[PDB]
Design a protein around this ligand. Structure first.
Ligand SMILES: [Hg+2]
Ligand SMILES: [Hg+2]
Ligand SMILES: [Hg+2]
Ligand SMILES: [Hg+2]
Ligand SMILES: [Hg+2]
Ligand SMILES: [Hg+2]
Ligand SMILES: [Hg+2]
Ligand SMILES: [Hg+2]
Ligand SMILES: [Hg+2]
Ligand SMILES: [Hg+2]
Ligand SMILES: [Hg+2]
Ligand SMILES: [Hg+2]
Ligand SMILES: [Hg+2]
Lengths: 341, 340
């Protein structure tokens, strides 16, 4: 039931963002939602190559860092590397099969592409600061504290993908497979998509943002400046990515795109609220682990805890959720220097 | 059983290209096959923005073409628009879920991205040479002769995706699904992927080169120069794309990757041959439609037929297949100018 070229002539301006007729012709002269075309144009305008950033002094900077600061630096970078590894592939494997307007289709492929550039940039840094990159790369997979902080990201995508496959193969209904009942409901699949996109919003809008504070705290001391330049370019992309998910989510909950989806979103208001708080809690928990045997000029576990609360309130507000934390001004206004957006 | 972040610490240098553990960490410091890393670098080096291309003279040129030349030009562009629509999405939906080495995964995503840029360039031209783009785009979907020429492309991808979903959901074996016996064979799925790759090779290496020749026949008349600029950029990318599939296919044939894929390539040899012979015939058949209202000096059914045979023999040789066609020299050596 999925096809790479639906042979039915359809009005692409009238399809929903998701679950409609798969996109046939790729055209960009018109859109149902011009935000997605504007994001494509902007991301293309921002194209960069990691190899064109001078990183030659980052190795000696890193080596001269006190052992606990090396630990803060490398652990933060390993988590960034985990997140971009996942985001390189997942928007394509998880969202593309479900998209039914051309502007959003191409936005997702362009988004995913920009993520692979991010992963390439993380290799560029690692190669240039450690003798054996394999040690860093292997620790990403098995590192207990990172299985923990991002515990649950791959599962949301994975369940969405599995349910999408059942939907595409069998359609809605009550089915049997090898002696067991398998229920496929479009409503449940819409719910999974909604929560997946909420989680992707928290990933890019908060999890990655909190990581920028660690990277740019070294930059403020004129250390790891090659890395800083790369993270700066990544943050400029991230601003677009979270703008895309913000719009998808707001168009889904308003009811202008799919009334069923607006019901679903109201229905999981509490669940979503609680998912946001958990992501924030996970990032707080990591902060402590980062800072377990020392702190830095400009950063420590309580400052980065406050930043997690600050950023979380802003993002939740932006997608129409209640604020879990005490309202405060930015605890690290110096970071605005680096977040050019 | 697909996962976006596989949990086992595996040696990515020892996975197969396809069907191994899904890639976890995306790293570019090492490769099983450096050709794919070299292709990513080159394609990134070629980044272009379609809208920056000046096509302001193409509307003048186009509107002044005789009607039969408008037909030739726009039928060709509509077919290019079809193939890049499919290619923008298909490598990511059909291949990406089966890749087990990071360099191949990222190449497939870069390749696909580059195809969405091709599609964006077709919009750029179309919107600047006609007053209603929708008539052009709508016709791509319903045009009986366009779809006849493309028959089998989306069908092949679609079949591979369905079979892949069954494999990820149920695993190998014989299953009972809504009372029907469904066999999931990894060997059969490997054959499907393998022949999909062969078909993609024919698509980029033959079907698109035939279309380039029709595009450049106008450039040779000093017409449609914005478009020719765009097609030259497209062709530069296409050369990388076909290099990628040639190397995937030839590495599989070698036995140096998955040994079962090497058995499959040999076993399915005739199927490989047949699919190239059918694609070539479809490209020939398109001539009657293309030249329906008349042909052009140096571009007609005979010339097109000759070029199809010429290029098909070259691509077939490059992946170890016998040649179906009589050997010939290039019937349109003027195209070399445009193909750098
Ligand atoms: Hg998602
Ligand atoms: Hg998700
Ligand atoms: Hg941090
Ligand atoms: Hg819900
Ligand atoms: Hg919700
Ligand atoms: Hg909600
Ligand atoms: Hg949420
Ligand atoms: Hg906190
Ligand atoms: Hg706090
Ligand atoms: Hg294919
Ligand atoms: Hg031609
Ligand atoms: Hg073959
Ligand atoms: Hg011929």
């Amino acid at each position: 039931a999925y096809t790479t070229f639906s042979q039915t002539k359809n009005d692409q301006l009238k399809e929903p963002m998701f679950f409609g007729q798969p996109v046939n012709v790729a055209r960009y002269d018109q859109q149902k939602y011009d935000i997605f075309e504007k994001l494509i144009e902007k991301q293309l305008s921002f194209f960069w190559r990691p190899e064109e950033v001078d990183v030659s002094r980052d190795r000696i900077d890193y080596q001269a860092l006190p052992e606990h600061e090396k630990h803060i630096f490398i652990s933060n970078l390993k988590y960034q590397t985990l997140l971009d590894s996942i985001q390189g592939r997942s928007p394509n494997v998880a969202l593309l099969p479900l998209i039914s307007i051309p502007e959003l289709e191409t936005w997702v492929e362009t988004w995913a592409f920009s993520e692979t550039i991010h992963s390439r940039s993380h290799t560029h840094i690692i190669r240039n600061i450690v003798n054996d990159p394999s040690v860093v790369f292997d620790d990403i997979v098995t590192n207990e504290q990172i299985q923990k902080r991002a515990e649950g990201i791959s599962s949301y995508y994975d369940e969405l993908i599995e349910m999408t496959s059942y939907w595409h193969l069998l359609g809605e209904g009550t089915h049997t497979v090898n002696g067991k009942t398998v229920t496929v409901s479009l409503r449940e699949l819409k719910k999974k998509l909604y929560l997946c996109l909420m989680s992707v919003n928290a990933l890019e809008a908060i999890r990655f943002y909190v990581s920028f504070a660690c990277s740019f705290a070294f930059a403020e001391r004129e250390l790891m400046e090659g890395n800083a330049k790369i993270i700066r370019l990544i943050a400029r992309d991230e601003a677009l990515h979270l703008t895309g998910t913000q719009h998808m989510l707001n168009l889904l909950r308003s009811g202008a795109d799919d009334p069923e989806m607006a019901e679903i979103a109201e229905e999981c208001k509490q669940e979503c609220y609680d998912l946001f708080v958990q992501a924030a809690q996970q990032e707080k928990d990591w902060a402590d682990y980062l800072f377990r045997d020392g702190s830095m000029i400009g950063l420590n576990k309580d400052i980065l805890c406050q930043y997690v609360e600050y950023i979380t309130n802003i993002r939740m507000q932006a997608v129409g959720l209640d604020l879990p934390f005490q309202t405060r001004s930015n605890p690290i206004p110096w970071i605005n220097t680096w977040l050019v957006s």
